[model samples]
Target: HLENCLGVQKIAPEQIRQLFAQTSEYHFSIPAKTEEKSNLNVFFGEGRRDKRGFVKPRPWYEVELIVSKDITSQEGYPVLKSFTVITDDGWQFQCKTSGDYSKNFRSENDLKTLGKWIKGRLESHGCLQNNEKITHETLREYGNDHFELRSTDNPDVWLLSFKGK
Candidate 1:
């Protein structure tokens, strides 16, 4: 009789949230953090497992970005621009504008580049509103990577990226 009850049972969302609050973290950095700790079991990339399991999230830092370089191809409309971004550590990426650029050399940042961040990072899970496509116009250019040990395989394999690249 109890086996039937177990199948019918459901935990409340608030309970689920509290359980996660005990185990997980907020969507972003928490202010005035305490020294408390929590751990949980998870599997990550390549279908891997670890004794270390998962740990709480680290603090977040804000950075200032300046356009180190900018150029545009000619037109009364002034189409086709490229930019190199600079933050704290390394000099960063290439941004191309789609005004029929006189230059046609495209690296297709979708390949191990901007495509992933535009989709994987900046979009989804309350980070962005649903179904709004990212265009050159509204590219906020920020990213977040939420790592957990319970997915495809080993954890840090997903951690190898830099600057949300």
Candidate 2:
């Protein structure tokens, strides 16, 4: 199978296994490119505020990353990688990465940089086409180590997954 970003990270397989395992209920939603393009909505933490403006309690942001142990090559080795960053704001942004082809997999540094870049873009550009920028500190705060393991395209290559709780 062609290793798309999701496949490269093995998120599908891991999620399937996670579904079978008994874990606390966590909500996840996959947005199609079309949907992302059509609207920009930030994912607010669960629960609604009362008339008095008191915030209802619930999990706000919780996600994890999954990484594979080995590396594999495809199509002369995928050099540059692309990703879709999902924000709690219900918005998705497209981004790309450049690195050595021999590496075959993303390092922890790579993932951290990706997260930082996304935060930058979100802060500067806002969630949708708006001009408002989110606070950099807020972005970093949300960019916690909420990643998980999904599936792998190649056994040798590791899969890195991220989730929000």
Name the candidate that leads on TM-score: 2
Q: What would the per-residue lDDT of candidate 1 be over residues 7-123, giving only the tens digit for each residue?
A: 112345554343333322211111111111211001111222357875543211111111112222212211244433211121134433342333221112322233233233444
Best by lDDT: 2
RMSD of 1: 22.5
Error of 2 at 73 (Å): 16
**Can you give the TM-score per candidate against the true fold?**
0.21, 0.23
Name model 2 segments beyond 4 Å from true. 1-15, 18-136, 140-153, 156-158
Candidate 1: stretches off by over 4 Å: 1-78, 86-91, 99-112, 123-165
Q: What lDDT score goes with residue 130 in model 1? A: 34
Q: For model 1, what is the alpha-carbon lDDT of residue 85? A: 22
